Design a protein around this nucleic acid. Structure first.
Ligand code: ANP
Ligand code: ANP
Ligand code: MG
Ligand code: MG
Ligand code: ZN
Lengths: 619, 461, 184, 164
DNA sequence: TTTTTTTTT
């Protein structure tokens, strides 16, 4: 026994010397200082870093994990006591691990009884969750008959500590005086359990997927929900059971978690910040970004400018009396078949964080907004709050479902009042929609409003509407066909001919078709848009005067002069569209002020959207 | 590492009550309002004191910050010390006089203390819940204690917590046991049992020493003239919409309310609550024990800005202009909404009733600020509901029959027009409601009743 | 003796006949099990494949080899060969992918051994299903659909989506489709 | 530096600011500054190993003139004869091991060879080699009186080495 | 089990 005590003293001394080395080469003392300044209570270590300096500790920490981990946490407490900073937290300090596992990287299928008592790392999908509940750890009692204070500690099989005690709640003194609980001094901890299942990409065909149960406490609780793809590090252990003194030999097993990694976004370095400064200081950054958006699709330049404005977004105003004015931008595409509407929707789904895609073919309005299931259930536009919804085949939706969207696209709210449920829900998001015209193909002998075939109250809620036509014209046909075949004959420069798929500027651009002008890399696009989204520009007087004159001119213009025809309704919402597009353009310049240079581009884009010349079949 | 010298803490608390003050508005002197409220309890014009912890924090007293932190960190214990100091202050004010008898428990206590006559004996014979007959509650306003329902976790057990929310469910007031009193058959002695929590177990055999030694086997019979009861109520409170994270649904919590804080809320109200977070007597269930409640729907006093208007008169044009000043024009529409916000008189000649309130229908082309006007009216009115044509059923507007799966019972659940009673209901997108949903409001708009005959229910609302 | 068998297997078992812990249910404690029942190639197989590829009439020979019990239908058999082999699959630097699958439809009278052609393709294909969801189950494979007069997102996007009360998900799978109709 | 300009530019727009190895080397100290190094070697736990085979064992000190607590010690010596292929070339080997080979050792060993006249046929030279000096690289760079060498040829008339 | 109600497909 005394040899065991000497060995535990040696192991704790080794871990303490590693943690509090005089000149710390791994900077865990500075990380402890960061932890105590931030008020956190567990420290993350690299097992690969322990492996270099103390390999006899590191490999023993996998096989004999319980004793080694207890010794390491004791050494952490002594290292904290050597600081001039105070230990505020009433729960102890803890350790989590990362690194290379090798043998002990497993699945729910391959976790079997050979691994019991070892440290393991496992992967899967969360399928259940308990609600967070509080669990007693120590209890403090006051004896009013004697002015003494009594304390008691509690332990459980699910805890890492192997020690066990009576677990009876104390009520009386040894002299049988009654006792009073001190709730402000007793100690509790947050507790949660969940389960993980095999990933569907790894489960063998036909069979059912296998699953494992998990226990998490303290700061690890309230971190996951169903559907999360996770990697989990902990000790695999077994739990006995009893009924009336008779025991079945089949015991249950769990994972007691040390650390959780999420698998399902930005990254920066000062070289990247320098390059963002340079490109922002260049001559026409908005045009460069609009050209660089989606290079493998020919044409569609004005729609690409509109999509860039959608990805940047406008400014919300909340006034002094609580009134709100909308910030988001909404875009609709109608046109002939095979004109890349769905392709652009899928591209925006890749580029935008917090994005959801649906179709009008298989969506109810209840499922699109919110549902009663009694409980209340979120829909797609609620889930995409402060984000983007892409809707395809928007003409195939029913009007009963369409009328449910009218509140969301303007007020940013979903309100329900049905049996037993009365609630608001926030649904602030941007809508991007694609559709085909009424007749399945655009009729040139009828007006654009007749071909679109939707009511004015719905059409007014879109900031921009684009009508896309597939006109037969030998020049355009030749150019489009040449672009498509050039994209199809392409192969990477460092690739052999028989292979199969199972910096700032781009360098190979034959696939893009654009001959000489440069194009930015998509990773740089993601970084630039992420930074430029946070700029908060203000308006100015020249912008205000230009917007106010231009709005009246757009409303008063008469189309019988020019043989054009009107594509949109014009209401007071389009004035706010001008304001939103001006702020979105000013964001790309990293400007703090909106100017005439921004408002002129916004007007040119809106005036392109508003009017269209009559088709050649009618002319 | 604990402090249990209660006398020093009582000295600090009594110094706070003695030395907090506010200057008189005419400058004539100083008011000492907490000891004025103590004397109101002593003369029995009152039943509770509400103490503001921030006044203790910002008082000009030594150890004031330490006292405030100790109150906040172990609030369930400091309530007893506040009650003890107020009891000592009451006896110092009262002297050799007697407080007036007003109820049967007061009559029993005043009669029995002098039957005992005909401080150690008093404190040993009677428990302090029976000797002291008033309530103490705490409040906070500093933003350090502001939290959501979602954030109250294991660190908050036993602490004072403040939050803001919406009331979903509320029970009616019930009598709750606080102290039971039993009397023995044979030896005529009495047993006092204080009750804590939601359960108690009655003792069976008499404990008095003469009865026990004689083995007289006297039973104990409980008596409700000596026993103490208190008003009890239960609520469920939901998160406010601004508190919820992105793309998420609000959570709820159970609240227990006692005494003078009962009947301050009904369903469809928004409240500010201060209370203590506690478990139920190794995994535990929890609730909130309310200390103070404030209706933000409700909250002879007049503001100076109103006094200027009331002296001015001719206010009609300014009142019309002040409704949603971000919206340009529509002066006559704002006047119509101003009249709908006030309404006429109810008439009840010879048994025949006539509706007093005014109904307005707005129509217009798209983009002319109808929804903005309805939102401003919903913020301006005291009790009001907002609905849309698509998001509401004809049962969610009027009232619903609910079948409880736990018990099998049937019950009624009031809809939007029931919750808005005495106020205004705003209905947006009114043309897109179904006909068989729309025809439910025919009785409400003219007779102001809802009448139901379904399953095993037949009522009028 | 664990994880040695899967449902559907035919077995013979040696074991002890036991009663589970005055009436008990029985069970068998197993002492012995006896079972009653691609992607790798040899140089001989590679030389055979290359000999067929070296032949000039290889494409016509494969088209002839499709369903020899059924007369004629030469261009249809050529089309089925194109369906089996498919095109290349591409992903450009902007991330927009280009499909490799090929899809074929058959119309006309309900006879003339259409179902037998579909069953032949089901047998020959490396992965595949025949049927009258089912659309999901053939990543990298071929699905034959009979009686097609009984999805646009599935064909073009290789994905279907849903948003009904309380669910929204997307199911993604890559396959080629051969369809037979009796006649949108 | 441009990184400070970048952080300033981010703060000026209002974007959140939260968005040497040189291998092994030697060192030289002159004059009065040596006393700081003396106190550093006295103090640090960096040089006093608290974990390993040399747990709590202080650093080694070596000298060529007596000092208090110094122990007198000697290197291990051995020797071999090799013969091969019927040639004239029998080879005779001497080894000195198990301690530091201090600079005076090579100087005295040169005199041992030249005194015993092994150079007499200078057409058959004698060679000497000293090993693992790269661990102490730099100790001969500070002056023109020293040299780096690893293998040396001895004759009576001269001593030779490579350019290194 | 059978019966009655309100949301969803
Ligand atoms: N420059 C281009 N212009 C148009 N189409 C192109 C171009 N380059 C490639 N395509 C192809 O044309 C198709 C684009 O149409 P797609 O987006 O799939 O459906 P859609 O445009 O929404 N028509 P629909 O879904 O029937 O209403 C894809 O097969 C693209 O590969
Ligand atoms: N006269 C106005 N003054 C100020 N803002 C206005 C005015 N007219 C329209 N708006 C703006 O127009 C936008 C749409 O307002 P909204 O209340 O939804 O119109 P609406 O009458 O409800 N149209 P609809 O609900 O489709 O029938 C808001 O951003 C308003 O601020
Ligand atoms: Mg499409
Ligand atoms: Mg409206
Ligand atoms: Zn008795």
């Amino acid at each position: 026994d005394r040899a065991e005590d000497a060995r535990k003293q040696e192991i704790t001394e080794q871990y303490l010397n590693f943690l509090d080395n005089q000149a710390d080469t791994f900077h865990y003392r500075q990380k402890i200082v960061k932890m105590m300044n931030d008020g956190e209570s567990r420290l993350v270590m690299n097992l690969d870093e322990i492996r270099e300096i103390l390999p006899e500790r590191a490999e023993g920490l996998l096989t004999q994990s319980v004793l080694e981990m207890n010794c390491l946490q004791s050494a952490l407490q002594m290292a904290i006591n050597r600081s001039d900073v105070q230990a505020v937290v009433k729960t102890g300090f803890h350790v989590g691990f990362e690194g290379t596992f090798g043998e002990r990287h497993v699945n729910p299928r391959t976790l079997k009884s050979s691994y019991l008592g070892n440290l393991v790392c496992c992967e899967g999908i969360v399928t259940k969750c308990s609600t967070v509940r509080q669990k007693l750890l120590t209890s403090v009692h006051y004896c009013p008959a004697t002015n003494k204070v009594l304390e008691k500690k509690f332990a459980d099989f699910t805890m890492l500590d192997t020690a066990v005690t009576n677990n009876n709640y104390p009520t009386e003194d040894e002299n049988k005086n009654p006792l009073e609980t001190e709730f402000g001094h007793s100690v509790y901890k947050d507790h949660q359990t969940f389960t993980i299942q095999e990933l569907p990409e790894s489960a063998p065909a036909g069979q059912l997927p296998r699953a494992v149960d998990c226990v998490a406490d303290l700061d690890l609780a309230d971190r996951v929900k169903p559907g999360d793809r996770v990697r989990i590090i902990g000790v695999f252990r077994v739990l006995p059971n009893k009924q009336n003194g008779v025991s079945s030999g089949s015991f249950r097993s769990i994972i007691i978690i040390n650390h959780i990694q999420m698998l399902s976004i930005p990254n920066f370095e000062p070289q990247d910040v320098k390059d963002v400064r340079k490109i922002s200081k260049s001559r026409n950054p908005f045009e460069l970004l609009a050209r660089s958006l989606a290079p493998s699709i020919c044409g569609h330049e004005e729609t690409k400018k509109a999509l860039l404005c959608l990805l940047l977004g406008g400014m919300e105003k909340i006034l002094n009396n609580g009134s709100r004015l909308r910030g988001d931008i909404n875009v609709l595409l109608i046109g002939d078949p095979s004109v890349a509407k769905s392709q652009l929707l899928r591209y925006v789904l890749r580029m935008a964080p917090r994005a959801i895609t649906t179709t009008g073919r298989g969506s109810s309005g209840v499922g699109l907004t919110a549902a009663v299931t009694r409980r209340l259930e979120a829909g797609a536009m609620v889930l995409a709050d402060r984000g983007v919804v892409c809707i395809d085949e928007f003409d195939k939706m029913s009007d009963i479902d369409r009328t449910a969207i009218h509140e969301v696209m303007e007020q940013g709210r979903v309100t329900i009042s049905k049996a037993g449920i009365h609630a608001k829900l926030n649904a602030r998001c941007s809508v991007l929609a694609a559709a085909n015209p009424v007749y399945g193909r655009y009729n040139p002998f009828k007006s654009p409003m007749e071909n679109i075939g939707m009511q004015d109250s719905l059409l007014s809620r879109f900031d921009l509407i684009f009508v896309l036509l597939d006109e037969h014209d030998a020049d355009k046909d030749a150019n489009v066909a040449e672009h498509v075949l050039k994209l199809h004959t392409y192969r990477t420069q460092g690739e052999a001919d028989g292979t199969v798929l199972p910096s700032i500027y781009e360098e190979n651009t034959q696939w893009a078709g654009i001959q000489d002008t440069k194009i930015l890399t998509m990773d740089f696009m993601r970084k630039y848009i992420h930074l430029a989204r946070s700029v908060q520009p203000k308006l100015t007087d020249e912008a205000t005067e230009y917007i106010s004159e231009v709005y009246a001119d757009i409303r008063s213009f008469d189309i019988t002069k020019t043989d054009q025809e009107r594509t949109m309704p014009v209401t007071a919402r389009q004035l706010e569209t001008l304001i939103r597009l001006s702020t979105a353009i000013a964001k790309a310049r990293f400007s703090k002020k909106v100017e005439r240079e921004d408002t002129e581009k916004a007007y040119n884009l809106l005036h392109f959207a508003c009017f269209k010349e009559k088709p050649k079949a009618r002319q | 590492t604990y402090n249990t010298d209660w006398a020093a803490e009582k000295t600090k608390i009594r110094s706070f009550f003695d030395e907090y003050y506010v200057d008189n508005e005419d400058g004539s002197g100083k008011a000492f309002p907490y000891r004025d409220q103590v004397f109101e309890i002593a003369r029995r014009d009152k039943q509770a004191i509400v103490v503001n912890v921030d006044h203790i924090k910002e008082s000009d007293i030594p150890d004031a910050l330490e006292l405030s932190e100790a109150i906040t960190s172990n609030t369930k214990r400091y309530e007893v010390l506040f009650k003890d100091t107020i009891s000592d202050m009451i006896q110092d004010y009262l002297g050799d006089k007697q407080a007036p008898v007003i109820d049967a428990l007061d009559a029993y206590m005043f009669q029995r203390l002098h039957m005992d006559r005909n401080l150690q004996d008093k404190r040993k014979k009677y428990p302090p819940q029976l000797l002291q007959r008033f309530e103490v509650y705490f409040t906070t306003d500093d933003a350090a204690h502001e939290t959501c329902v979602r954030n109250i976790k294991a660190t908050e057990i036993g602490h004072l917590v403040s939050m803001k929310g919406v009331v979903i469910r509320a029970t009616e007031v019930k009598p709750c046991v606080e102290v039971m009193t039993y009397t023995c058959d044979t030896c005529a002695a009495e047993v006092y049992q204080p009750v804590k929590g939601m359960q108690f177990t009655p003792p069976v055999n008499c404990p008095n020493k003469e009865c026990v030694e004689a083995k007289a086997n006297g039973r104990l019979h409980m008596q409700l003239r000596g026993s103490k009861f208190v008003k009890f109520q239960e609520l469920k409170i939901q998160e406010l919409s601004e508190q919820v994270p992105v793309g998420s649904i609000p959570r709820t919590m159970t609240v227990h309310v006692y005494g003078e804080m009962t009947r301050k809320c009904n369903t469809g109200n928004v409240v500010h609550v201060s209370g203590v977070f506690l478990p139920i007597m190794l995994v535990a269930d929890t609730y909130l024990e309310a200390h103070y409640i404030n209706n933000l729907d409700d909250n002879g006093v007049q503001s100076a800005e109103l006094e200027v208007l009331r002296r001015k008169g001719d206010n009609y044009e300014t009142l019309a202009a002040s409704i949603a000043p971000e919206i340009f024009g529509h002066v006559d529409v704002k006047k119509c909404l101003l009249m709908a916000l006030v309404g006429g008189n109810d008439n009840s000649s010879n048994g025949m009733k006539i509706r007093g309130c005014i109904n307005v229908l707005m129509m217009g082309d798209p983009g002319v600020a109808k929804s903005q006007l309805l939102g401003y009216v919903n913020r301006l009115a005291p009790r009001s509901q907002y609905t849309t044509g698509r998001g509401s059923s004809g049962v969610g507007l009027t009232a619903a029959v609910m079948k409880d799966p736990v018990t099998g019972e049937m019950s009624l659940e009031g809809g939007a027009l029931v919750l808005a009673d005495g106020g205004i209901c705003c209905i947006d997108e009114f043309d897109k409601m179904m006909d068989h949903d729309r025809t439910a409001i025919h009785e409400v708009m003219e007779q102001q009743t809802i009448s139901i005959a379904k399953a095993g229910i037949m009522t009028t609302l | 003796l664990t994880d040695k068998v899967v449902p559907g297997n035919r077995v013979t078992i040696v074991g002890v006949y036991s009663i589970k812990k005055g009436i008990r249910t029985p069970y068998l404690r197993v002492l012995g099990i006896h079972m009653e029942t691609f992607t790798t190639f040899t140089p001989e197989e590679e030389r055979m494949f290359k000999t067929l590829a070296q032949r000039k009439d290889a494409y016509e020979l494969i088209a002839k080899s499709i369903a020899p019990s059924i007369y004629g239908s030469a261009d249809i058999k050529k089309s089925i060969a194109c369906l089996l082999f498919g095109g290349a699959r591409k992903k450009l630097p902007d991330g927009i992918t280009r499909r490799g699958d090929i899809n074929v439809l058959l119309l006309g009278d309900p006879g003339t051994a259409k179902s037998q052609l579909l069953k032949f393709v089901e047998q020959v294909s490396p992965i595949g299903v025949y049927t009258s969801g089912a659309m999901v189950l053939a990543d990298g494979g071929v699905v034959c659909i009979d009686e097609f007069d009984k999805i646009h997102e599935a064909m073009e996007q290789q994905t279907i989506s849903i948003a009904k009360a309380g669910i929204t998900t997307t199911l993604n799978s890559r396959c080629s489709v051969l369809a037979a109709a009796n006649s949108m | 530096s441009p990184m400070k300009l970048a952080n300033q530019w981010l703060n000026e727009i209002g974007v959140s600011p939260r968005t040497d190895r040189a291998g092994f080397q030697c060192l030289v100290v002159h004059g009065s500054k040596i006393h700081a190094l003396f106190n550093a070697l006295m103090d640090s736990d960096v040089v006093h190993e608290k974990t390993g085979p040399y747990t709590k064992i202080p650093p080694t000190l070596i000298a060529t003139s007596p000092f208090l607590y110094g122990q007198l010690l000697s290197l291990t010596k051995s020797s071999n004869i090799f013969a091969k292929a019927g040639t004239k070339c029998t080879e005779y080997e001497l080894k000195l091991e198990n301690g530091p080979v201090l600079p005076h050792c090579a100087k005295m060993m040169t005199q041992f060879i030249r005194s015993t006249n092994m150079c007499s046929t200078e057409e058959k030279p004698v060679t000497m080699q000293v090993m693992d000096r790269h661990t102490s690289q730099g100790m001969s760079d500070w002056t023109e009186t020293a040299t780096n060498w690893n293998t040396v040829t001895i004759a009576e008339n001269c001593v030779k080495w490579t350019k290194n």
